[PDB]
RNA sequence: GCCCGGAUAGCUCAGUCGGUAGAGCAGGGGAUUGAAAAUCCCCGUGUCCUUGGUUCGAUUCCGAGUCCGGGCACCA
């Protein structure tokens, strides 16, 4: 899908539109192979990008160029560390490794986006979370140091979400020996890292970042404070499905 | 993955069983001016996206393909 009704609110046209995007992954995959940024999702992002490179007499009176792609490869760490003792950094290593696994599971789409005209970047875990996280976490806690801000409401909502998720997860294996306070606090840590990912990402990348869903968790609270007056955080919503196979160039298995 | 709409003059779209599809823009020709600029008037051979059927005949009715959207399922 798209948001043509949202293109005029910013009112910056007749030029290349710097865009970004960030994918995620859950520990226990309920939909298994089906997930965000599947093959259909990447091909549909490419198609929605190419839809603005056509109709030059109807878009001048929408363009897609210079794009980037982020990955929260270092977000769901403690989510996977519950299965085995392992280590604190080993859980990171493995989760970011699966992130890079997907990054290689659809590299053809990333490279073919460059043939369609759009640039291709590849942000990762450390590539973003490697600078200015002390002041970021400090500001997150400064917003979460009072029950008046809706940051506590979003905290409780995401906490209930991750709590149901971790309850269903540990309901299969009770050998984790984790704590309810531990699950809640690790979920809140991931949530605050996602909230602090508005400051660091909005400052690291120019203009806007688009996700298929809404993704207003933490991003709204932080970006309305800082990014909305430094680098406008505009979230565009995408949405596709499966019905008729589109034309995919070099759509074959590697050999 | 499942389910629901459209494509018509060059372009926008309006056309409701199946009863020779027309309003706006554009564009050509005019009268009048010395000439243009306003105003009036004339001007559409459209397989209604191709290709198989009912009919007396199908725009929209049934079958096959091409291209634009929607509603769900999965939220994280
Ligand atoms: C899921 O765990 C999300 N918090 C991860 C995420 C999604 C989109 C953008 C940034 C982070």
Please provide a written account of the structure.
The chain has 255 residues and is mainly alpha-helical. It has a single domain, classed as Rossmann fold (3-Layer(aba) Sandwich). It contains 9 helices and 4 strands. The protein has helices at 7-10, 39-50, 88-105, 107-115, 125-129, 134-143, 151-170, 180-204, 219-225; strands at 19-20, 22-23, 70-71, 208-209. The strands form 2 sheets. The chain has a two-stranded parallel ribbon. The radius of gyration is 19 Å and the shape is globular. The two termini are 34 Å apart. Bound molecules: phenylalanine. Residues 22, 24, 72, 75-76, 194, 197, 211, 215 line the site of phenylalanine. It binds one RNA strand of 76 nucleotides through helix 7. This is Cyclodipeptide synthase.
Write the layout of secondary structure elements.
Layout lengths: L6 H4 L8 E2 L1 E2 L15 H12 L19 E2 L16 H18 L1 H9 L9 H5 L4 H10 L7 H20 L9 H25 L3 E2 L9 H7 L30
Parallel strand pairs: 1-4, 2-3
Helix pairs in contact: 6-8, 7-8, 8-9
The site of phenylalanine (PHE) has 9 residues, from helix 8.
The chain binds one RNA strand of 76 nucleotides through helix 7.
